[PDB]
Amino acid sequence: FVAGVINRERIPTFERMLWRVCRGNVFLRQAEIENPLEDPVTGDYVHKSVFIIFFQGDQLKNRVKKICEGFRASLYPCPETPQERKEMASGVNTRIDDLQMVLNQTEDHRQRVLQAAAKN
Amino acid sequence: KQFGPLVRWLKVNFSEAFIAWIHIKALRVFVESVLRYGLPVNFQAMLLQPNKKSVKKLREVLHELYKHLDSSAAQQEYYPYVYYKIDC
Amino acid sequence: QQKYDDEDISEDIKFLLEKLGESVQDLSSFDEYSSELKSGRLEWSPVHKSEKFWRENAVRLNEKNYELLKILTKLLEVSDDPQVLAVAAHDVGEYVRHYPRGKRVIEQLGGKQLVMNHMHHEDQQVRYNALLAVQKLMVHN
Amino acid sequence: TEFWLISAPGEKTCQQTWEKLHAATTKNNNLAVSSKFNIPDLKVGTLDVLVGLSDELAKLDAFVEGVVKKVAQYMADVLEDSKDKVQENLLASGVDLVTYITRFQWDMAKYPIKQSLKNISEIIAKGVTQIDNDLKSRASAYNNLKGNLQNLERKNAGSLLTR
Amino acid sequence: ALSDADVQKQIKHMMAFIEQEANEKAEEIDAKAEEEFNIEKGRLVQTQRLKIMEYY
Numbered sequence: 001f002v003a004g005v006i007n008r009e010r011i012p013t014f015e016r017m018l019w020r021v022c023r024g025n026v027f028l029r030q031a032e033i034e035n036p037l038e039d040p041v042t043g044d045y046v047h048k049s050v051f052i053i054f055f056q057g058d059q060l061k062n063r064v065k066k067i068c069e070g071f072r073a074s075l076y077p078c079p080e081t082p083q084e085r086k087e088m089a090s091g092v093n094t095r096i097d098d099l100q101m102v103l104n105q106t107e108d109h110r111q112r113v114l115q116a117a118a119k120n
Numbered sequence: 121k122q123f124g125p126l127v128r129w130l131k132v133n134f135s136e137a138f139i140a141w142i143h144i145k146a147l148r149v150f151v152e153s154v155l156r157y158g159l160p161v162n163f164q165a166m167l168l169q170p171n172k173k174s175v176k177k178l179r180e181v182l183h184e185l186y187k188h189l190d191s192s193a194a195q196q197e198y199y200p201y202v203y204y205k206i207d208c
Numbered sequence: 209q210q211k212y213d214d215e216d217i218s219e220d221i222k223f224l225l226e227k228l229g230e231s232v233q234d235l236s237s238f239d240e241y242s243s244e245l246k247s248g249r250l251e252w253s254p255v256h257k258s259e260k261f262w263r264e265n266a267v268r269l270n271e272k273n274y275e276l277l278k279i280l281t282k283l284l285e286v287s288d289d290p291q292v293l294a295v296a297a298h299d300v301g302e303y304v305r306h307y308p309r310g311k312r313v314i315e316q317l318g319g320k321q322l323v324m325n326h327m328h329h330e331d332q333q334v335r336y337n338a339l340l341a342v343q344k345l346m347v348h349n
Numbered sequence: 350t351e352f353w354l355i356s357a358p359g360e361k362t363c364q365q366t367w368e369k370l371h372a373a374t375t376k377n378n379n380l381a382v383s384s385k386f387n388i389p390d391l392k393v394g395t396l397d398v399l400v401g402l403s404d405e406l407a408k409l410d411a412f413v414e415g416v417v418k419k420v421a422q423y424m425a426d427v428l429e430d431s432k433d434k435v436q437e438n439l440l441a442s443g444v445d446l447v448t449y450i451t452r453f454q455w456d457m458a459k460y461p462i463k464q465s466l467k468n469i470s471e472i473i474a475k476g477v478t479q480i481d482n483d484l485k486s487r488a489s490a491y492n493n494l495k496g497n498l499q500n501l502e503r504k505n506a507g508s509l510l511t512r
Numbered sequence: 513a514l515s516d517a518d519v520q521k522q523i524k525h526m527m528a529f530i531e532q533e534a535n536e537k538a539e540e541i542d543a544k545a546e547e548e549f550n551i552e553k554g555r556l557v558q559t560q561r562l563k564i565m566e567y568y
Contacts, residue, residue: 019193019513023156025396025526027519056526057397095349098324102342105327109339122491123427130424131439133484137417138441140473142453143460144410145354146388147470151403153356154393158525163359165386166368167451169352174377181374185367186357190513202356207418208438208446395533396526 001052001064003031005074007039008049014071018053021063028053054079145204152202163202236261238268245279250292256299266306274313277303281314284322290331297326297334301341311345320345350437352450354386387454389462391469402466409474416481423488 006014015028032049039046052068052075055061068075078085146165153163170178187200194200212218236258244250255261271277280303283296300319304311314320323345326338357364365385372379393399424431424439431439441449459476460469506512514522 016193019190020198022396023522024514024519025522027516057395057400059397059400063400098342099346099349102327102339102346105335105339106343109336122494123429126427126487126491127429129484129487130420130427131430133480134417134420134424134439135441135443136480137413137420137477138439138446138449139456140477141410141413141417142441142450143456144406144413144470144473146386146453146455147391147466148403148406148410149354149356150388150391151399151406151466153359155396155399155403157358158522159528161359162362162365163356164364164368165354165356165388167352167354167382167384167386167453168376169350169382171377171380174381178376178381181376182355185374189358192513204354206352206354206450207414208350208352208450395529 001029001054002050002075002077002079003029004050004052004077005048006050006052007042007046007072008032010071011049011051014067014073015051017067017071018064021067022053022055022060024053025060026054142206145206149202149204156202232258238265242268242271242276245276245283248283248287248292250283250287250289250295252291252295256295262302262306266303269303269307270310274310274317277310277314277319278317281317281319281322284319284326290329290334293326293329294331294334294337297323297337297341301337301344304341304344304347308347311347314345350447382451384451389455389457391462391466393466398467402470405467405470409470413473413477416477420481420484423484426488427491 018024018028028051030049030051033047035045036048038044050073052073053064055064067073078088149165154160157163168178182199182201185201190200197203232254235254237255238261241255241261244253244255269276277300280296280300283292284300287293287296300314300323304314311320320342323338323341326334327342329335329338355368357368368375369383369385370379376383421431421439422433425433430436438446440446460472464472
């Protein structure tokens with residue numbers, strides 16, 4: 001399906017469950033990240049991999065959503081082969097940089113205001 | 121006089137229900153084989169009346185026979201071979 | 209909040225407060241704000257801080273072809289008075305917060321880029337107003 | 350009595366004799382009774398349709414298990430040709446369950462070979478539903494008549510005060 | 513479980529099913545073509561004949 005996000009802890013058993021669903025109908029998109037970013041919920045730089053299957057059947061996709069719910073598999077993509085997906089990725093990078101720089105400015109402003117608030 | 125044909129009623133209706141039951145189970149086996157394999161051929165359904173206490177031996181035999189096929193996925197329903205139970 | 213025995217004091221305070229409330233309610237009008245921006249006479253005022261003007265009249269901020277919001281963009285590029293620019297940034301932030309769908313129009317207009325520029329303004333208040341405006345513009349981004 | 354309905358991949362025709370006659374590695378070295386099966390050759394549609402079909406088949410088989418064992422229990426209550434202890438089973442296809450299981454054949458007459466799988470499942474579901482409902486009505490009527498008979502017996506039971 | 517070669521074999525199985533679906537859809541469109549032939553042909557013949565007979 002996608003080189004999504006998983007903490008790589010139940011990926012083997014995730015493959016086993018998907019092999020108990022279908023007989024491995026489609027090769028699972030495989031990717032791994034070394035020393036990844038902080039997870040939004042866990043709040044730590046946890047290791048991440050991903051092993052997820054693409055499907056053509058509707059019931060199969062429903063089961064994939066079910067097993068993604070049952071497991072710790074974050075999946076919110078727009079998996080489109082053509083170039084518009086990569087243009088979307090570039091725009092996402094631009095927004096990410098904007099978020100980073102505004103967050104830095106806000107943090108510095110907060111620090112200054114807090115120092116003044118202490119001294120008063 | 122109700123009991124008279126009541127025997128025929130219940131016996132015939134149980135006959136129909138049982139026939140439907142075994143037919144459904146055969147369809148289930150056909151579907152399971154056709155899914156666990158691709159374009160299928162002579163999957164060889166088989167009937168077993170297991171001897172007493174020899175369930176463990178039969179499970180071992182079938183595991184040795186066909187556990188290479190999956191080796192990771194197929195228990196209560198996940199066997200290395202298509203499996204069903206029948207009461208009688 | 210304090211209570212006085214002289215009923216006259218309480219009655220006069222009630223009168224003055226009520227009529228001042230009425231006066232500031234009368235001040236609150238999109239026509240006033242639009243005139244301020246059309247002639248460029250920008251300054252902090254109760255209209256610039258009236259919650260009903262930002263919330264109820266958020267549709268009024270959606271001008272014809274968003275020309276008033278384009279005037280905000282023009283002032284983000286043109287106005288050099290720091291207070292006027294802070295006013296523009298705060299008003300843009302209010303408009304985005306009460307109408308997130310206009311933020312895409314702002315990005316098309318390039319006003320968002322102007323607020324990115326105004327983050328590093330030479331006056332701290334303008335920096336703060338631009339910061340809040342962009343922070344509102346970062347919703348769902 | 351317990352029977353098992355298994356199946357192998359079937360890559361080779363030697364699998365026919367490996368599962369039945371191959372006493373070296375077959376079931377308990379050819380001690381458990383081994384018998385071939387009749388299974389129709391039926392068309393399949395698409396994969397998600399097959400997933401839905403398998404789920405529906407499992408659910409319907411569970412319901413039919415309930416139905417068949419329930420009619421067996423009601424016949425046991427009737428106490429004729431089946432009892433909760435003796436005559437543990439009735440006759441399917443007019444023969445005892447062992448003979449029908451051992452010689453199970455496909456009833457294409459009722460479920461034609463050229464009907465899709467879903468249509469056959471639907472036909473079976475309708476047939477068993479109507480059969481079960483009608484038999485429940487008949488058994489309820491018979492049990493109500495029995496209860497009325499026993500109530501009349503109780504009214505004619507006691508001593509010279511209440512009998 | 514399955515090797516990568518077996519994954520390509522299962523892709524080929526998906527292809528057999530896809531071609532089966534294609535055949536089904538093409539034959540269904542052919543059946544619908546026959547049905548519309550019958551219905552529209554009868555309709556047009558009826559309308560033209562009725563016009564001619566009213567003229568008559």
